[PDB]
Design a protein around this ligand. Structure first.
Ligand SMILES: *[C@@H]1O[C@H](CO[C@@H]2O[C@@H](C)[C@@H](O)[C@@H](O)[C@@H]2O)[C@@H](O[C@@H]2O[C@H](CO)[C@@H](O[C@@H]3O[C@H](CO[C@H]4O[C@H](CO)[C@@H](O)[C@H](O)[C@@H]4O)[C@@H](O)[C@H](O[C@H]4O[C@H](CO)[C@@H](O)[C@H](O)[C@@H]4O)[C@@H]3O)[C@H](O)[C@H]2NC(C)=O)[C@H](O)[C@H]1NC(C)=O
Ligand SMILES: *[C@@H]1O[C@H](CO[C@@H]2O[C@@H](C)[C@@H](O)[C@@H](O)[C@@H]2O)[C@@H](O[C@@H]2O[C@H](CO)[C@@H](O[C@@H]3O[C@H](CO[C@H]4O[C@H](CO)[C@@H](O)[C@H](O)[C@@H]4O)[C@@H](O)[C@H](O[C@H]4O[C@H](CO)[C@@H](O)[C@H](O)[C@@H]4O)[C@@H]3O)[C@H](O)[C@H]2NC(C)=O)[C@H](O)[C@H]1NC(C)=O
Ligand code: HEM
Ligand code: HEM
Ligand SMILES: *[C@@H]1O[C@H](CO)[C@@H](O)[C@H](O)[C@H]1NC(C)=O
Ligand SMILES: *[C@@H]1O[C@H](CO)[C@@H](O)[C@H](O)[C@H]1NC(C)=O
Ligand SMILES: *[C@@H]1O[C@H](CO)[C@@H](O)[C@H](O)[C@H]1NC(C)=O
Ligand SMILES: *[C@@H]1O[C@H](CO)[C@@H](O)[C@H](O)[C@H]1NC(C)=O
Ligand SMILES: [Ca+2]
Ligand SMILES: [Ca+2]
Ligand SMILES: [Cl-]
Ligand SMILES: [Cl-]
Lengths: 104, 466, 104, 466
């Protein structure tokens, strides 16, 4: 890292000079808690038929969505004190913070 | 295995299985397409799998400028010394700039309307065309960059293209920081969580880790609960701009053709300002436009965003609800009765227990959006903790935070404190009537609106080198 | 990880049910602070000629040892309140907790 | 390549550079051998390099049993159902067991006495032969395991080999935990740091991360400052065991032949009990037996252990002194005067600044061992914090912690509370006079010593399966 600079690098490299990749692009996320995988290190819960998580069957994500998230659209409650711009800035800001690559 | 076209579970695919009596997908041999997030250390039998952030974690407008050097250069106009970002060379929006088009192998945007032949847009981030309302914001900021570089070029004749670009990018970055921390976050967290997780800024602390935490990538998706089932478009007197004022969201995803051929970004920006967001209620969590019909036009089957969020948290090996509560110093309910008390909702607690068996296994997004919203906030305690903790690190651990001594002059900070999203809209669009601050609260025209003429523009005089 | 068990595994696997590799053998150390490398991710300070650490030259480990650690052996001070067994249990215990492999 | 035989800095080598005018290595272009620790994710251009722990982090006597299954099985006597650990088939120590020999490629132990032809020992951990005193402790615990299994077999005739081995192993692991937390750690940390970092055990907490922290691998090397320049050997009357009761350490490293051919483990164990450890003082940090002549008999030149500790911390990317002081909530000296105050030694502070320039760059081991020792402890505040924090996690985060509900019965716990290192020595050697508790403080014969006959045996009654 340059002893002195004037602006942010595009990658974020060198913002933190003692640990130059912190906050920079194409780096692993920090973990606030240890990961919880079916085999301890790689497989996602729900991967292996019959394998429970902490004593209980893994619920299908689509099942949880159907049972808890699904609701009749006519019941929608317009937020009297937030604009749709509140939603949109959220998405825009998220896209300044993180993008998690997947294989094509 | 092609994750898009096969339901076979093999690396790197993790398709969502279909439950019996599904309301839309009666064929249980089908599935919802899912690709596992790229592993930070492929094939390792030593490391605990982790995922990758392809962007800079800092609030630095990287969605405008790019987070990798090749892209960042390609987004720039190098034909001259003006320090501008490149604009669309084939289309304009009422004489104003559109984002340049991107060059993708299998452009999804083309699939949203075959005869229009409008590809996806090119921007600092790969998702600018995902919805026209997001595209409008990227376009707005692109215009503000060029507007700033132009004024700067008048104040400082000697400044070359590189200097103008960096100075304009630095102002835009501060703008995103100010709008986010001054206007947005207080309305996300509520006053109590705001004071607790984001105490008054002091100065840069190089011991504050600024990285995005893996959990944040799933927790911040709380915003999915705010999504309305339509894209609303209004004319210059804020009335339903016919013939299609309320387009179903399942026909706007990647619909870049709508920005180019259906009136530009003004109708869209006015719709965002004059329409309420959806409120998150415990039995009105997320609409079917994203739960049943996500990306329906651009792939073999409609996705389910809430379901993808839960499958993603498992893909990423994220701990369950109680583990995150414990992390945040919040009580961990063990019975349906205790969960009911935490949720102030026994009915939801029962549905959750029936699905998960224990609140220990509730997926972080599901648990987080299930909690009652904090007073004057739009998330509960758990998400407030995760989101507030993330944003304090992004602020305190940023050497280029706009308020850090040395980044801007005292007079420069005074000038920047006058910026607002409504003013930026006034400066870069054909809209002359905009929301009264705070823009994230105002949502009712004309009660909550004012003329642009009444809003002081950003004063760049303290940027003069003289 | 079996639902129940009566003894530790040899590898340490499954001691922690939710994250079964924690404390298990042949796993990465946990970091209490982000790493500090010359290039931000791999090269140790002292690797590249002329690369300073935080504004100062990297001190040769051998120079620090010579100038700060070296002392006259006949000046050695017996610890009136500790046995050499105190030293030995420390090494024995260390060998229960960590061994950092290197290529042969 | 071979980092042991060349000074080329190329993977996987990171040779220590030699300062001008070194008092030993006169050719300034030469070096001290050093191999980088294996990376967790080899060759990665995404991950921040990290190192690997080959052992179980738990205090579970893995140095006896092994941390990998094939090894664990190879350490066991599989020729019967007595649940014993295999013992040397070629040599005995006055009728008592010795560890079996290992089968290494470039066996270092053979090099220490070419004519004796005694190879290194095989144990749960690869370093058992590093010094005879360490070998003696390994041998002691192997005997204790076999002794336990034998008594358990008399108590429970129906118990098979697997059961006997597991029950004996469980007791041995408990013994290591008790001696460590009851007798050893209080004397390392001092009463004040013991109470702060190791408050009374309440229960197993499945949210406590039990992994060893990277910094601990370096910080726990504070022990190098305790090392005496000789291996002391004493006869049954605790008098010098002639012809050589004081062997320079540079001639005992990997000297397994001395255990086999020079009197067994009794003279070694006696020397450890009745000889003082070296006291760490600010101008007497570590001896030349390990600073100039480490492994002299098995390397091209003597290594420097203090210097290797510092090169290792850099190999491991460990933050400097002040970052660790900050982590520990301790004040961070920024000038020579401030460091002088923290170290209560301006002379040492000045020396550190001449070498490092800033306290931000002092290597963790060097800064750690430089601090004045806590009252009735042998580490300063920084090392107390790192060491105390680590041992709390190993205790609270261990599902098999000896006091954890369901591991042992109440009556078993009462019996285990009576174990002691002096008693274990009495049970497995020809020594009949041992130190008074605490063995780690007692160091003067005959004052601090008593008859084995005054110390009761571990009562195994409660292991009888009713
Ligand atoms: C079981 O053990 C759990 C782990 O406990 C730690 O290790 C053991 C061995 C002990 O030494 C113990 O003292 C250690 O805490 C334990 O869970 C832990 O509980 C604490 C206290 O509630 C949690 O701390 C809180 O953390 C949140 C989240 O931020 C943390 O993480 C980020 C990211 O790394 C850091 O940057 C932060 O600094 C935090 O470390 C904070 O929001 C919260 O602080 C705020 O609230 C308090 C209270 O109002 C205020 O004083 C502060 O100013 C803030 O406003 C706490 O710092 C910790 O996250 C959590 N760890 C885990 C792994 O879950 C659990 O309680 C134990 N259970 C029992 C029964 O013993
Ligand atoms: C610059 O920021 C630094 C980081 O601060 C955190 O993030 C920012 C954004 C804020 O939110 C801030 O509140 C956060 O703390 C900051 O350094 C931090 O300072 C604290 C306070 O001194 C340190 O906490 C102490 O940690 C040690 C070590 O244990 C910790 O780590 C282990 C391993 O991960 C965990 O298991 C533990 O739970 C701890 O988290 C503890 O020993 C110590 O607790 C003991 O002492 C206190 C007080 O006597 C007792 O009450 C406790 O019971 C214990 O006996 C503290 O918990 C923190 O480690 C440190 N982080 C870093 C990265 O250094 C720094 O102070 C800021 N400077 C300025 C000028 O703003
Ligand atoms: C127009 C509105 C929005 C979408 C359309 C949309 C879509 C997604 C999709 C497809 C993903 C990936 C799902 C998966 O895991 O397979 C997704 C991820 C994330 N979102 Fe979504 N989102 C829309 C809107 C929002 C809003 C308003 C958000 C925040 C307030 C928000 C956040 C996020 C985040 C943080 C992610 C993860 C990003 C990453 O890759 O790291 N979204 N959303
Ligand atoms: C007979 C006394 C001791 C040694 C001889 C000895 C030697 C070493 C060596 C060679 C290393 C590695 C150096 C390098 O980095 O290249 C080393 C590492 C560690 N030690 Fe040493 N040690 C002797 C004695 C002690 C005592 C009394 C210790 C603790 C009280 C102690 C600790 C450690 C630790 C924790 C390490 C790191 C182990 C790892 O690989 O993770 N040592 N020592
Ligand atoms: C670059 O700037 C000039 C002047 O504003 C403009 O004419 C040209 O079209 C721009 N080029 C691109 C690719 O945006
Ligand atoms: C597709 O775009 C064309 C213009 O190319 C437009 O006339 C048509 O209405 C669009 N189709 C739909 C379904 O909106
Ligand atoms: C196994 O045990 C028997 C009986 O104690 C003993 O004779 C034999 O030598 C042992 N074998 C090994 C390899 O220790
Ligand atoms: C080497 O071992 C032999 C016994 O095999 C012993 O007689 C001799 O003294 C040893 N050499 C040294 C230098 O101690
Ligand atoms: Ca960014
Ligand atoms: Ca162990
Ligand atoms: Cl995380
Ligand atoms: Cl560490």
């Amino acid at each position: 890292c340059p002893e002195q600079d004037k602006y942010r690098t595009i990658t974020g490299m060198c913002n933190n000079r003692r640990s130059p990749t912190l906050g920079a692009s194409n780096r692993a996320f920090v973990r606030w808690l240890p990961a919880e995988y079916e085999d301890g290190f790689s497989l996602p819960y729900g991967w292996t038929p019959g394998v429970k998580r902490n004593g209980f069957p893994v619920a299908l994500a689509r099942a949880v969505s159907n049972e808890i998230v699904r609701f009749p659209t006519d019941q929608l409650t317009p937020d009297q004190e937030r604009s749709l711009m509140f939603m949109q800035w959220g998405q825009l800001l998220d896209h300044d913070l993180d993008f998690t690559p997947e294989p094509a | 295995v092609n994750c898009e076209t096969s339901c076979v579970q093999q690396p790197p695919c993790f398709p969502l299985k279909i439950p019996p009596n599904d309301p839309r997908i009666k064929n249980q041999a089908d599935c919802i397409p899912f690709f596992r997030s790229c592993p930070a250390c492929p094939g390792s039998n030593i490391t605990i799998r982790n995922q990758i952030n392809a962007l800079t974690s800092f609030v630095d407008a990287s969605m405008v400028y790019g987070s990798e050097e090749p892209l960042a250069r390609n987004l720039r106009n190098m034909s001259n010394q003006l320090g501008l970002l490149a604009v669309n060379q084939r289309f304009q929006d009422n004489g104003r700039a559109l984002l340049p088009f991107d060059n993708l192998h299998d452009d999804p945007c083309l699939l949203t309307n075959r005869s229009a032949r409008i590809p996806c847009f090119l921007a600092g981030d790969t998702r600018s065309s995902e919805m026209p309302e997001l595209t409008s914001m990227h376009t707005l900021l692109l215009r503000e960059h060029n507007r700033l570089a132009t004024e700067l070029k008048s104040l400082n004749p000697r400044w070359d293209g590189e200097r103008l670009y960096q100075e304009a990018r630095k102002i835009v970055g501060a703008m995103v920081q100010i709008i986010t921390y001054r206007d947005y976050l207080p309305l996300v967290l509520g006053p109590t969580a705001m004071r607790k997780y984001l105490p008054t800024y002091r100065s840069y602390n190089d011991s504050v880790d600024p990285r995005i935490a893996n959990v944040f990538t799933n927790a911040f998706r709380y915003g999915h609960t705010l999504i309305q089932p339509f894209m609303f478009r209004l004319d210059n007197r804020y009335q339903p701009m016919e013939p299609n004022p309320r387009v179903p969201l399942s026909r706007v995803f990647f619909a870049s053709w709508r920005v180019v051929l259906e009136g530009g970004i003004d109708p869209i920006l006015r719709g965002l300002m004059a329409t309420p967001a959806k409120l998150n209620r415990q039995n009105q969590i997320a609409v079917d436009e994203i739960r049943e019909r996500l990306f329906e036009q651009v792939m073999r089957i409609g996705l389910d965003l809430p379901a993808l969020n839960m499958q993603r948290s498992r893909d990423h090996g994220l701990p369950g609800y109680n583990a995150w509560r414990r992390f945040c110093g919040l009580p961990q309910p063990e019975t349906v009765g205790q969960l009911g008390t935490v949720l102030r909702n026994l009915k939801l607690a029962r549905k959750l227990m029936e699905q998960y068996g224990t609140p220990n296994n509730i997926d972080i997004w599901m648990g987080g959006v299930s909690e009652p919203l904090k007073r004057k906030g739009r998330v509960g305690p758990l998400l407030a903790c995760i989101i507030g903790t993330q944003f304090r690190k992004l602020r305190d651990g940023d050497r280029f935070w706009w308020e850090n001594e040395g980044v801007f002059s005292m007079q420069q900070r005074q000038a920047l404190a006058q910026i607002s999203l409504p003013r930026i809209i006034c400066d870069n669009t054909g809209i002359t009537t905009v929301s009264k601050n705070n823009i994230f609260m105002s949502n009712s025209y004309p009660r909550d609106f004012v003329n642009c003429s009444t809003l002081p523009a950003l004063n760049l005089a303290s940027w003069r080198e003289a």
